[PDB]
């Protein structure tokens, strides 16, 4: 009684952030097990709708605040003690308040900051753990509250592509 498509906040997380790495050409050690791994197929339409749409979210919104993120970026400085308690500091204050589809999309841009900021210097596998916190932090928070408001598809189909 939940949908058929499967979205996973670990999987979501995964290949936005694997995107955000590939333009750079970092083969980003993310799916450690491969061993072709089929269970269902790869189609999957369903969530390939918003995949793109959550995908190129982050995009849009990064070319709009090119001047909030990056400087805070500073702050977050280097170390692996550090990174796992500033994360959840940062997303702390991206929701004081409360929740929203509008909030959410920095939320992506957040961990792409951060994973990035590790590869700068010599930590790619840490984005690999960036990644874990992400959803947990997702599923904690924003998962429950847009299983309550509706679900993956309202954002999609509130903000979804000209015509298609
Ligand atoms: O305006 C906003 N939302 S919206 O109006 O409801 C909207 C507007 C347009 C779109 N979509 C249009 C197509 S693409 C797009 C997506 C999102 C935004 C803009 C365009 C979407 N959406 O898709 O959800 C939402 C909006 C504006 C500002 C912020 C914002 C501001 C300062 C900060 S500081 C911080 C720390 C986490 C932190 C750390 C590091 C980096 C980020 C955040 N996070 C922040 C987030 C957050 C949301």
Not at 128 to 156: C, K, P, S
Request: aromatic share 12%; with cysteine.
């Amino acid at each position: 009684h939940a949908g058929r498509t499967g979205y996973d906040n670990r999987e979501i997380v995964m290949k936005y952030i694997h995107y955000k790495l590939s333009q750079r050409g970092y083969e980003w050690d993310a799916g450690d097990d491969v061993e072709e791994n089929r269970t269902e197929a790869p189609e999957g339409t369903e969530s390939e709708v918003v995949h793109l749409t959550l995908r190129q979210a982050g995009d849009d919104f990064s070319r709009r605040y090119r001047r909030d993120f990056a400087e805070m970026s500073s702050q977050l400085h280097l170390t692996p003690f550090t990174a796992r308690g500033r994360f959840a500091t940062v997303v702390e204050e991206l929701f004081r308040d409360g929740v929203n589809w509008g909030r959410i999309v920095a939320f992506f841009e957040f961990g792409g900051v951060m994973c990035v900021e590790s590869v700068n210097r010599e930590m790619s596998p840490l984005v690999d753990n960036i990644a874990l916190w992400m959803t947990e932090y997702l599923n904690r928070h924003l998962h429950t509250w847009i299983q309550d408001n509706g679900g993956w598809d309202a954002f999609v189909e509130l903000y979804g592509p000209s015509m298609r």
